[PDB]
Amino acid sequence: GGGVGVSTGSYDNQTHYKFLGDGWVEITAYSTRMVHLNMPKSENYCRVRVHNTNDTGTASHMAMDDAHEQIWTPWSLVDANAWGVWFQPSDWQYISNNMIHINLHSLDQELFNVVIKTVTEQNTGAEAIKVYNNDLTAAMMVALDSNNILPYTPAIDNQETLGFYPWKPTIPSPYRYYFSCDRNLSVTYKDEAGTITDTMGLASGLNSQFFTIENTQRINLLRTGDEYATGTYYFDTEPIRLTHTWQTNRHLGQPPQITELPSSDTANATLTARGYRSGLTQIQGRNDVTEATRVRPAQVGFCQPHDNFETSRAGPFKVPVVPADITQGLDHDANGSLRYTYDKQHGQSWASQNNKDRYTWDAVNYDSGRWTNNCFIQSVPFTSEPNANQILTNRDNLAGKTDIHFTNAFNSYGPLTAFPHPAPIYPQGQIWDKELDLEHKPRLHTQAPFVCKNNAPGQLLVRLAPNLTDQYDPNSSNLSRIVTYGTFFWKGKLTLKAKMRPNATWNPVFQISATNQGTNDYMSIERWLPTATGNITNVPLLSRPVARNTY
Amino acid sequence: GGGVGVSTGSYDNQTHYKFLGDGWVEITAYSTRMVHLNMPKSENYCRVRVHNTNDTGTASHMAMDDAHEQIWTPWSLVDANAWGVWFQPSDWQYISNNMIHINLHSLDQELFNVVIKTVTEQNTGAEAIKVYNNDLTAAMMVALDSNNILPYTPAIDNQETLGFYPWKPTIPSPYRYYFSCDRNLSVTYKDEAGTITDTMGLASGLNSQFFTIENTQRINLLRTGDEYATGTYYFDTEPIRLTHTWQTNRHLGQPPQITELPSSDTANATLTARGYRSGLTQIQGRNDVTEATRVRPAQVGFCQPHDNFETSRAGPFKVPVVPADITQGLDHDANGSLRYTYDKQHGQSWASQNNKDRYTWDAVNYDSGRWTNNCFIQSVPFTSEPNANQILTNRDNLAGKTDIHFTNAFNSYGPLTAFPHPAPIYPQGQIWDKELDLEHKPRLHTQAPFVCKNNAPGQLLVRLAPNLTDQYDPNSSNLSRIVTYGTFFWKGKLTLKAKMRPNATWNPVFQISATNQGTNDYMSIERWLPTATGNITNVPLLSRPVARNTY
Amino acid sequence: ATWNPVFQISATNQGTNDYMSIERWLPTATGNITNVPLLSRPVARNTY
Amino acid sequence: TELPSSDTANATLTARGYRSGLTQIQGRNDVTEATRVRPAQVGFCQPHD
Amino acid sequence: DRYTWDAVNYDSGRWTNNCFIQSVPFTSEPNANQILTNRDNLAGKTDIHFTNAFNSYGPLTAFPHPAPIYPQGQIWDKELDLEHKPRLHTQAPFVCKN
Amino acid sequence: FTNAFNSYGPLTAFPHPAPIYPQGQIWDKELDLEHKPRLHTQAPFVCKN
Amino acid sequence: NFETSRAGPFKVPVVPADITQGLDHDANGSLRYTYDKQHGQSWASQNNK
Amino acid sequence: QTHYKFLGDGWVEITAYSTRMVHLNMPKSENYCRVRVHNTNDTGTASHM
Known part of the structure; x- marks a missing residue:
C-alpha cells in the first residue's frame, strides 16, 4: 500500500558479513541518507x-587554465560512489586487515518518504518570519539512466557525492556535462616578450x-506516498588485491650464495667474487655477475614523464x-x-576555519617506486667506473x-x-568507474579501482516538478514560481565478495590499530571521536597493511 | 489505485523505432507536457x-478586413497537432533522410496529476504578498469529442498548440468557433471617390x-487523485512521400538522340536537325520536332490565379x-x-525583442514550379518567330x-x-486535418499532409469547475468566485509507419547536416543549441532531402 | 539521443568549391569520371 | 558560481585555491581544470619522422 | 593523384608546439629553466x-x-605470425585472427 | 639519444x-602483480595460475 | 640504464x-651466461667458470 | 548490386556483390x-637515405 501519512521505506545503514565457506565472505553494506533538494x-x-583572461592572459600561467564549455541542467544527481559512503571506519579496518582481495557484486537503490514543502514570507513588518507548509x-521527478546514454559524470571528481555521515543530511550534486569549444592557448615562460x-x-x-x-529517458513522478526502487544492478569487474607488495626488481629470484655464515651478529656476510660468480647478465664485454646487473624476470614499475602537459584541441592538460x-x-x-581536496561534509573537521582540507596519499606498494635523482643511464660498450662522459646522471x-x-x-x-x-x-576514494568507449582501452583507470566492463551502473537524476503561480506566460523571459524545496530518503545496498587472508609468516604482520591520544602519530584515536560541541573529523585510512610475496 | 499524495501517471517523452521486417519501421513517439490552466x-x-471601421472604412484596404462573428466559450482545448510537438530536431533529421514515405497509425492521450490551487492576498499593507495553497x-472538467459534433478548430492556425519544448510548461488554447453574420463589403482602389x-x-x-x-458531450470530473485516458484512436489516411521530385515536364520521356559524342568536355552535343527529327507533337502546319513542342505524358504543375480574392456572403478572402x-x-x-508567423513558445528565439518570428517556406519539389514572367501563349495557326501580335507575353x-x-x-x-x-x-506544421463534410471534396487540404477519411481524432476540452464564495446570487449579473488555477500533465503516444529508402544512385545523395558556427548558412549548429542564459531557438528544417524519379 | 541535428555526408551544388561538390561524382561530357575519398564517421559519439 | 547574466557574459568558477578536487601535483593547494586527474590518457605523444 | 587523409576523431590529436614539460617540484609561473618548451x-x-x-x-x-x-582503403589484413602482436595494424581496419 | x-x-x-x-630455464612462475609483463625475459614458459 | 627503487640501482x-x-x-x-663444469665448461679448463 | 536486410532491432546484413572483367x-x-x-644514384650522395 501507500499514501500520505504512511511511510514507504525503512532506514538501514548497518553492514553485514556472511561466511559462504572456506575463506569466502559476502559483505552486504547498507547505507541510507536524508537528501535535501x-x-x-x-x-x-x-x-x-x-x-580566464586574468589567469592565462599573463605569461607562463598555462597550468591554471580553467577554460571549458559545459551544458548546465536543472537536474541533480544522487551519486553514491565513494568508499566513505558505504562503510564506517571500523568496517574498513576489519576489511583492510583480514582479507587478500575483494570484488563488487551488486548494487540496489531506493527513494522513499518524499516530502515537498513551500515557503511564504510574512509579514515583512519588524522582521520577516518564513512560514513552511x-x-x-506536489511531485518530484526521478529518472535513472540504465543505458548510460547521458555523459557519465562522477560526482566524486568535485567531492559532491553524498555525505559520509549517516546522521547528517546531505545534498545532491547538480548535473552538468562538457561541451566542445576547441580552445587555443600558447606556451610561455615566466617573463617573456610576446x-x-x-x-x-x-x-x-x-x-x-x-x-x-x-x-532521453523515462521520468517517474513521485508524490508523498510514492516510492521508487532501482532494480538490482550486477557488476562485472576484476577483484582487487588488498595486500601490498614490498618486493623490488632487485629482490626477485634466488639470492647469491654466501661463502659462509657470519661469525657475530654485527658481521656482514661475504659473497663469491664478482669475477668468479656464476649467473646471467645482459652486459657485454665484461666477465662479472653482480646483484645490480644480473637479469631479472621483469621490470617492476617504470620511469615516467612527470609534470608533462600535452595539448589537444581542448587545451593543455x-x-x-x-x-x-x-x-x-x-x-x-x-x-x-594522489592529492585530495575535500570539504567538511566528506572529511576535514568542523573546527577547521579553512575552506577545504587537503591530504596527499603516498602510495603503499614499496616495490614499484622510483628514486629519480639516483637513476642513471650508462654508455655502451659498458665499463666499470664510467668517466663523466660515459654516464647520464x-x-x-x-x-x-x-x-x-x-x-x-x-x-x-x-x-x-x-x-x-x-x-x-x-x-574520498572512488569505488567504480565506467570504461571509455574507445576501441583501444587503458589497462587501468587511475583513480578508480573497479571498472565496469560492459555497462556501468546507471546515474540517478532527480528534480522538483515546477510549481507555477496563477500568472504564467509561456513566452515570458522570466518565470515566477512558488518557492519550493523537498527532502527524501536514499537507501542502497552494495554486496561484495572477499576472501580471508592466509598467514604463513612466522613474525607478526602489520595491522591498522588505534593509538592513545597525546602522541602525534596519524592514528591517534581522538580524530575518530566527536568533540565536545560535536565537531567530527574523518581522515584517510591506510589500506593494504599486510605484506605479500610478489614472486 | 489512486488518491491524494499518489501520482497517477508517468512522464515519457522519448521516441522509439522498431523494424518490422524489410524496410518497414514502426515509429512510436511519446510526448508529455505540463499544462497551466x-x-x-x-x-x-x-x-x-x-x-473594422478604421481599416475597411478607408478605400482599398479590403485585404485586411478582419470582420467576423464568433462564439466565445469558457472551455479550453489541449491541441496536440503540430509536428514540432512530437519530435525533437534530430529525430526529424533521421526520418527525413532515411525514409521514402511515412503514414499515421494511432493516437493515445492521457491526463494525470491534476493539481488545483487557490490564491489569496495579504496583507495589502506595505506590498501585498500572494499566498498559494x-x-x-476541487475538480477539473474534461470532455473529449469523439464524434466531432462541435466545430473542428485546429489550434495551430493561431499557433496556439502545445509548446515544442519538453521541459518548459505550456498553456491550453481557449476554445471558440465561428458564427454567421453575413458581412457586406465593397471594392475600391487606393484613392477613389465614393x-x-x-x-x-x-x-x-x-x-x-x-x-x-x-x-453536447459527457464531462469527466477529475480531482487530484483522478486520471483520464483517451482510448486508442486509429487513423485512416494515405501515406505521404518523403522524397522530392526534380523532374519537370520537359524532362519526361526519352531524350533526343545525339548525332555523336562530344570531342572535349567543353563541347556541346548536337542533335538531328529539327526539320528531320522524328517524334510526336500537337503543333499543326509545321514540320518540326523540338524539345519544347514535343508531346509529354502529362502536365506537371499548372498555372494558377494568384492574389485573387473571391467573396461569398462572408466577405472577401x-x-x-x-x-x-x-x-x-x-x-x-x-x-x-507558405509564410508562418509564430511566437517564442513554438519557435522564434528568447533573445529576440520582436513580438513574433516569421519564416517563408519555399517549396521543394522543383518540378512543378512556374516562372511567371517567361510563360507565354502563342496564336494559332502556329508560327515560328511570332510577331508581337501573335504572342501573349x-x-x-x-x-x-x-x-x-x-x-x-x-x-x-x-x-x-x-x-x-x-x-x-x-x-509549426500541422500533422492532420478533418475532411470537409461537403459531398464533392478537394483533392488535398493545403496546410495539412494527412486528412482523416471518415472521422478525425477528437478534440480534448478542459475547464476548471467554478469555486464559489459564500455569497452566490444566481440572478446576479456579476459572479464573484474564488481565484483559482490548476496544472496537469498531458501525455500522448503517436504511432507511425514508414519505409526505408532504397538508394540505387551512384553519386552521393543530398542530406540534412549540421554545419560549423561562424558561417552564415541556414544549418549553423548554434541555432539548435542553448545560449548562456538558456535562450533557445527552433527553426524550420528542410524536408524531403532525397531526390526521386517521377517518371 | 541528441536534441540537435547530427552532422551528415551530403552532396552540394556545383559552383561552390567545397569538397562535396556533386560534379565530382558525375561523368563529364567525354565520360571522364573521378572518384575521391569520402569522409567516414560523420556522427559524433560520447567517449565517456 | 552562478549562471551568467547575459549571453555574452562568461561564467565564473570557485577560486582555484578553494576548489575541491583531485590532482597529482605536489606542494601546491589548487585544483584547476588543466592539472586535475583524469581517468586515462587520450592519445599519446609519438616519435615522429 | 595524391590525397592526404586527415584523421577524424578530434579527441586524440596532439598540437606539438604547445606541449611542454615542467620541472619538479612544481611551480606556478615557471622561469625559463623550469619548463621544457x-x-x-x-x-x-x-x-x-x-x-x-x-x-x-x-x-x-x-x-x-x-x-x-x-x-583506396584496405578492408582486411593478415596478422603477423610473431608471438607478441601489435594491438592494431595501421592501414587495415580488420585483422583476421587465425 | x-x-x-x-x-x-x-x-x-x-x-x-x-x-x-x-643453461636455459624451462619455465617460470608469474609475478603476483595485477598488471603483468607480456613475457618474462629468461624463461620461455610461464605458468599461468 | 639503471633504475633505482628502495632496494638499490639495477x-x-x-x-x-x-x-x-x-x-x-x-x-x-x-644474454650472457656464466656457468661451471657441472653444467658445462670443460673439465680440462683451468678457469673457474 | 548491393543488398540490405534487417534481421531485427537495429541489425542489418549487408550483402555486397561485385563483378569485373579481367584482362590477363x-x-x-x-x-x-x-x-x-x-640505388647507386640516390643513396650514393649524402643525406638521401
Whole structure:
C-alpha cells in the first residue's frame, strides 16, 4: 500500500558479513541518507563557458587554465560512489586487515518518504518570519539512466557525492556535462616578450552534442506516498588485491650464495667474487655477475614523464601518472601520488576555519617506486667506473635548462614492465568507474579501482516538478514560481565478495590499530571521536597493511 | 489505485523505432507536457463580433478586413497537432533522410496529476504578498469529442498548440468557433471617390448554430487523485512521400538522340536537325520536332490565379494556392509558398525583442514550379518567330492596367495536370486535418499532409469547475468566485509507419547536416543549441532531402 | 539521443568549391569520371 | 558560481585555491581544470619522422 | 593523384608546439629553466625538438581505432605470425585472427 | 639519444625469445602483480595460475 | 640504464633481439651466461667458470 | 548490386556483390627470377637515405 501519512521505506545503514565457506565472505553494506533538494535555480538548459583572461592572459600561467564549455541542467544527481559512503571506519579496518582481495557484486537503490514543502514570507513588518507548509499534491521527478546514454559524470571528481555521515543530511550534486569549444592557448615562460593567443572557438557542427533528460529517458513522478526502487544492478569487474607488495626488481629470484655464515651478529656476510660468480647478465664485454646487473624476470614499475602537459584541441592538460611508491627521495610527482581536496561534509573537521582540507596519499606498494635523482643511464660498450662522459646522471642539465633533467622526459614503459594496481582509499576514494568507449582501452583507470566492463551502473537524476503561480506566460523571459524545496530518503545496498587472508609468516604482520591520544602519530584515536560541541573529523585510512610475496 | 499524495501517471517523452521486417519501421513517439490552466475569464458563453471601421472604412484596404462573428466559450482545448510537438530536431533529421514515405497509425492521450490551487492576498499593507495553497476537493472538467459534433478548430492556425519544448510548461488554447453574420463589403482602389458599404448583417434563422459543451458531450470530473485516458484512436489516411521530385515536364520521356559524342568536355552535343527529327507533337502546319513542342505524358504543375480574392456572403478572402516550387523568378505568391508567423513558445528565439518570428517556406519539389514572367501563349495557326501580335507575353498590360497581367487570372488546371502533394514542416506544421463534410471534396487540404477519411481524432476540452464564495446570487449579473488555477500533465503516444529508402544512385545523395558556427548558412549548429542564459531557438528544417524519379 | 541535428555526408551544388561538390561524382561530357575519398564517421559519439 | 547574466557574459568558477578536487601535483593547494586527474590518457605523444 | 587523409576523431590529436614539460617540484609561473618548451633546441640542433623523440605511450593511454577509407582503403589484413602482436595494424581496419 | 630513446608502442610486434639447450630455464612462475609483463625475459614458459 | 627503487640501482631487462651488423649486443639485449663444469665448461679448463 | 536486410532491432546484413572483367596477358617470362634493385644514384650522395 501507500499514501500520505504512511511511510514507504525503512532506514538501514548497518553492514553485514556472511561466511559462504572456506575463506569466502559476502559483505552486504547498507547505507541510507536524508537528501535535501532545492528547486533548480533556472528551469531551462544553458550552454555556458568559463574563460580566464586574468589567469592565462599573463605569461607562463598555462597550468591554471580553467577554460571549458559545459551544458548546465536543472537536474541533480544522487551519486553514491565513494568508499566513505558505504562503510564506517571500523568496517574498513576489519576489511583492510583480514582479507587478500575483494570484488563488487551488486548494487540496489531506493527513494522513499518524499516530502515537498513551500515557503511564504510574512509579514515583512519588524522582521520577516518564513512560514513552511506542505504541498501534498506536489511531485518530484526521478529518472535513472540504465543505458548510460547521458555523459557519465562522477560526482566524486568535485567531492559532491553524498555525505559520509549517516546522521547528517546531505545534498545532491547538480548535473552538468562538457561541451566542445576547441580552445587555443600558447606556451610561455615566466617573463617573456610576446603575445598569448588565449582564444576559444565557435561551436562545431561535427562535435556538438546536446542531451536533454526529458527527451532521453523515462521520468517517474513521485508524490508523498510514492516510492521508487532501482532494480538490482550486477557488476562485472576484476577483484582487487588488498595486500601490498614490498618486493623490488632487485629482490626477485634466488639470492647469491654466501661463502659462509657470519661469525657475530654485527658481521656482514661475504659473497663469491664478482669475477668468479656464476649467473646471467645482459652486459657485454665484461666477465662479472653482480646483484645490480644480473637479469631479472621483469621490470617492476617504470620511469615516467612527470609534470608533462600535452595539448589537444581542448587545451593543455597534465597526463596521468600511475600511483607508485614514493622512494626515500620523497619525490611525489614522478611517482604520481594522489592529492585530495575535500570539504567538511566528506572529511576535514568542523573546527577547521579553512575552506577545504587537503591530504596527499603516498602510495603503499614499496616495490614499484622510483628514486629519480639516483637513476642513471650508462654508455655502451659498458665499463666499470664510467668517466663523466660515459654516464647520464640526473644532476646534469637537459637542453641547457637548469631544472629540466632527463628523468623528466624519460619513459621506460615496455613489454617487460609489471606494476601493481593502485589501492582504494576509504574516505574520498572512488569505488567504480565506467570504461571509455574507445576501441583501444587503458589497462587501468587511475583513480578508480573497479571498472565496469560492459555497462556501468546507471546515474540517478532527480528534480522538483515546477510549481507555477496563477500568472504564467509561456513566452515570458522570466518565470515566477512558488518557492519550493523537498527532502527524501536514499537507501542502497552494495554486496561484495572477499576472501580471508592466509598467514604463513612466522613474525607478526602489520595491522591498522588505534593509538592513545597525546602522541602525534596519524592514528591517534581522538580524530575518530566527536568533540565536545560535536565537531567530527574523518581522515584517510591506510589500506593494504599486510605484506605479500610478489614472486 | 489512486488518491491524494499518489501520482497517477508517468512522464515519457522519448521516441522509439522498431523494424518490422524489410524496410518497414514502426515509429512510436511519446510526448508529455505540463499544462497551466487558468479559471476562465467569463463563466458563460458569448456571441461577439469584430468589425473594422478604421481599416475597411478607408478605400482599398479590403485585404485586411478582419470582420467576423464568433462564439466565445469558457472551455479550453489541449491541441496536440503540430509536428514540432512530437519530435525533437534530430529525430526529424533521421526520418527525413532515411525514409521514402511515412503514414499515421494511432493516437493515445492521457491526463494525470491534476493539481488545483487557490490564491489569496495579504496583507495589502506595505506590498501585498500572494499566498498559494491547494484545494484537494476541487475538480477539473474534461470532455473529449469523439464524434466531432462541435466545430473542428485546429489550434495551430493561431499557433496556439502545445509548446515544442519538453521541459518548459505550456498553456491550453481557449476554445471558440465561428458564427454567421453575413458581412457586406465593397471594392475600391487606393484613392477613389465614393462610399464603402462595410456593413454586417443580422443573425440568420437558417444558418445560426449555437453549440454548448455541456449539452453536447459527457464531462469527466477529475480531482487530484483522478486520471483520464483517451482510448486508442486509429487513423485512416494515405501515406505521404518523403522524397522530392526534380523532374519537370520537359524532362519526361526519352531524350533526343545525339548525332555523336562530344570531342572535349567543353563541347556541346548536337542533335538531328529539327526539320528531320522524328517524334510526336500537337503543333499543326509545321514540320518540326523540338524539345519544347514535343508531346509529354502529362502536365506537371499548372498555372494558377494568384492574389485573387473571391467573396461569398462572408466577405472577401484569398483562395488557397497549392504549394509549388518557386522558379528562378523568385516569385512566391504565384507558386503559393507558405509564410508562418509564430511566437517564442513554438519557435522564434528568447533573445529576440520582436513580438513574433516569421519564416517563408519555399517549396521543394522543383518540378512543378512556374516562372511567371517567361510563360507565354502563342496564336494559332502556329508560327515560328511570332510577331508581337501573335504572342501573349507577361509584360503586356491586361485591361489597360499596368501591373495586372494575364498570368494573374490564367488557370491551367485540367485533366492532364499532375502535381506532388506538398510537404510537412517540422516546427509549426500541422500533422492532420478533418475532411470537409461537403459531398464533392478537394483533392488535398493545403496546410495539412494527412486528412482523416471518415472521422478525425477528437478534440480534448478542459475547464476548471467554478469555486464559489459564500455569497452566490444566481440572478446576479456579476459572479464573484474564488481565484483559482490548476496544472496537469498531458501525455500522448503517436504511432507511425514508414519505409526505408532504397538508394540505387551512384553519386552521393543530398542530406540534412549540421554545419560549423561562424558561417552564415541556414544549418549553423548554434541555432539548435542553448545560449548562456538558456535562450533557445527552433527553426524550420528542410524536408524531403532525397531526390526521386517521377517518371 | 541528441536534441540537435547530427552532422551528415551530403552532396552540394556545383559552383561552390567545397569538397562535396556533386560534379565530382558525375561523368563529364567525354565520360571522364573521378572518384575521391569520402569522409567516414560523420556522427559524433560520447567517449565517456 | 552562478549562471551568467547575459549571453555574452562568461561564467565564473570557485577560486582555484578553494576548489575541491583531485590532482597529482605536489606542494601546491589548487585544483584547476588543466592539472586535475583524469581517468586515462587520450592519445599519446609519438616519435615522429 | 595524391590525397592526404586527415584523421577524424578530434579527441586524440596532439598540437606539438604547445606541449611542454615542467620541472619538479612544481611551480606556478615557471622561469625559463623550469619548463621544457618545444621552441628550444635539442642537442644543439635547430630543427630537432624534444617532441620529435618523446614517447608518451603507457598503461593509461587510450586511443580510438582508426577509420576505413572508401576508395583506396584496405578492408582486411593478415596478422603477423610473431608471438607478441601489435594491438592494431595501421592501414587495415580488420585483422583476421587465425 | 639511442641510449635513452624508447620506441615501444601499440604498433610494435616482436617474436618471443628462444630456449637455450644447456643453461636455459624451462619455465617460470608469474609475478603476483595485477598488471603483468607480456613475457618474462629468461624463461620461455610461464605458468599461468 | 639503471633504475633505482628502495632496494638499490639495477639494470632493467631488455628483450632479446637480433644483433644487427653493428655487432652491438647490449642495445639488443643478448644474454650472457656464466656457468661451471657441472653444467658445462670443460673439465680440462683451468678457469673457474 | 548491393543488398540490405534487417534481421531485427537495429541489425542489418549487408550483402555486397561485385563483378569485373579481367584482362590477363601471357607472363613476360615463363620462369621465376630473383632480382634486386639497388640505388647507386640516390643513396650514393649524402643525406638521401
